[PDB]
Design a binder for this molecule. Structure first.
Ligand SMILES: NC(=O)c1ccc[n+]([C@@H]2O[C@H](COP(=O)([O-])OP(=O)(O)OC[C@H]3O[C@@H](n4cnc5c(N)ncnc54)[C@H](O)[C@@H]3O)[C@@H](O)[C@H]2O)c1
Length: 417
């Protein structure tokens, strides 16, 4: 009946750059328009690691099959895709050049290029995270690990002794609140001190380069800091991890405020992988400052270039870059983009809603739900101190969310509402 559109073409009437949230949109853009347009997708990496369940992963509450998903699956069968990165974007020409060189034209462009992980900002990090024994752990799995490597789970369990550092890189970085495992670790290391598994000649400090944990929600940052103390955890601000020596287990830090670097023995290091701005977005004059797209806060349309959009993490938005945010930014992009193909006005506005669980304990969580102005809704920091209510919501996310990300990329389950 309906036939797959061509990938061997010279221009399309929509072009999506990304598969994770750029693909869920296309599958939504079709069901919203009934296939009246031919849309192309061009991602860069083959696998989509589901970082929304990254802590239930490290607890082995989610199997590796439910955490690793191919990028093709997000895209529907009809829409053609190719795993080639766009070399440059010519917005004045309405065109997009890929790595191979095949110039592609467009009518509307949707950018979901996220924040690109740059393991090389931290020298020697990747080669220590790939080692199946070294105590260097990170926010994501390398692609050379096979189905039988479960090093990720050993971070909390194998912390018998020594100095442990949890390092947060410089904003903008991916995985703000969803990759903070320093409250479940404390609980599990509070037991290990009680029966002797974890020595008392050990120190754990949070090396945060940024001044605050959550830039766009004051209430969450205040709660995190207040709760970090009540536990007894120590934080070091304005310090960022700069190098890792895998032989002697030395970690070179630098306090950007004073520019004064230190070297410290580690025996358990975790880092939230550091990102890096892509230059083809700055040669094209789209990004603003930090490297994020200069888009409207309400409609998500680019300030200049009325026909370019942007969503997800690539977009410069005053909210927490979560997934449930993007669930609301594809509903908006797929509307306006279609209103712009019909000439009509852009009637869909983004409220700034973003919802990410924060795990306060081994089996408890609280939701960070907040709109554009940092203002939280009825769930913001509820049942934060644990209890039967937070216990259940933990199971509903750990045992029941990874089973859903298959549908999202299928199409069988759409957004929350
Ligand atoms: N906790 C973490 O460390 C982490 C890291 C990445 C993503 N995430 C989650 O994923 C959610 C969605 O992320 P996103 O959609 O904003 O970005 P993303 O991290 O999912 O990646 C964006 C997609 O665009 C592709 N891409 C990047 N550069 C490209 C280029 N030059 N050309 C073509 N394709 C390119 C990528 O391969 C990818 O398919 C985020 O809200 C976040 O919750 C978390």
């Amino acid at each position: 009946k309906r036939k797959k559109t061509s990938g061997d073409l010279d221009n399309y009437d929509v072009l999506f750059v990304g598969a994770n949230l750029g693909g869920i949109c296309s599958n939504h853009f079709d069901k919203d328009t009934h296939g009246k347009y031919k849309c192309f997708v061009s991602f860069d990496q083959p696998i989509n690691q589901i970082y929304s369940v990254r802590i239930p992963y490290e607890q082995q509450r989610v199997r590796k099959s439910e955490y690793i998903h191919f990028s093709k699956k997000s895209i529907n069968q009809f829409t053609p895709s190719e795993m080639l990165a766009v070399k440059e974007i010519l917005p004045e020409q309405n065109a997009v050049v890929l790595s191979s060189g095949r110039r592609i034209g467009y009518n509307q462009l949707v950018l979901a290029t996220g924040l690109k992980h740059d393991f090389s900002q931290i020298k020697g990090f990747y080669e220590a995270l790939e080692h199946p024994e070294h105590p260097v752990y990170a926010n994501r799995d390398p692609e050379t690990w096979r189905s039988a490597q479960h090093k990720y789970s050993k971070y909390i369990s194998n912390f018998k002794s020594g100095d442990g550092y949890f390092c947060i890189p410089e904003y903008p970085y991916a995985g703000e609140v969803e990759c903070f495992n320093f409250f479940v670790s404390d609980e599990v290391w509070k037991w290990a001190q009680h029966h002797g598994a974890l020595s008392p000649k050990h120190t754990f400090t949070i090396v945060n380069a940024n001044e605050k944990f959550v830039h766009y929600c004051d209430s969450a940052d205040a709660f995190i800091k207040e709760r970090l103390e009540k536990r007894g955890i120590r934080v070091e601000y304005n310090t960022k991890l700069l190098e890792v020596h895998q032989d002697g287990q030395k970690a070179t830090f630098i306090n950007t405020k004073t520019g004064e670097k230190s070297v410290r023995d580690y025996n358990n290091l975790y880092s939230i992988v550091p990102s890096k701005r892509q230059e083809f977005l700055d040669k094209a004059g789209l990004t603003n400052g930090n490297g994020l797209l200069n888009v409207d806060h309400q409609t998500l349309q680019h300030k200049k270039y009325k026909n370019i959009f942007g969503l997800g993490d690539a977009a410069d938005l005053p909210t927490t870059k979560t997934f449930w945010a993007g669930w609301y930014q594809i509903a908006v992009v797929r509307n306006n983009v279609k209103r712009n193909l019909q000439g009509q006005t852009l009637n869909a506005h983004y409220d700034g809603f973003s919802k990410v669980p924060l795990f306060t304990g081994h089996q408890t969580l609280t939701y960070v739900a907040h709109s554009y102005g940092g203002v939280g809704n009825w769930q913001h920091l509820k049942h934060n101190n644990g209890g039967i209510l937070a216990w259940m919501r933990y199971r509903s996310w750990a045992k029941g969310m990874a089973k859903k990300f298959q549908d999202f990329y299928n199409g069988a389950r759409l957004g929350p509402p």
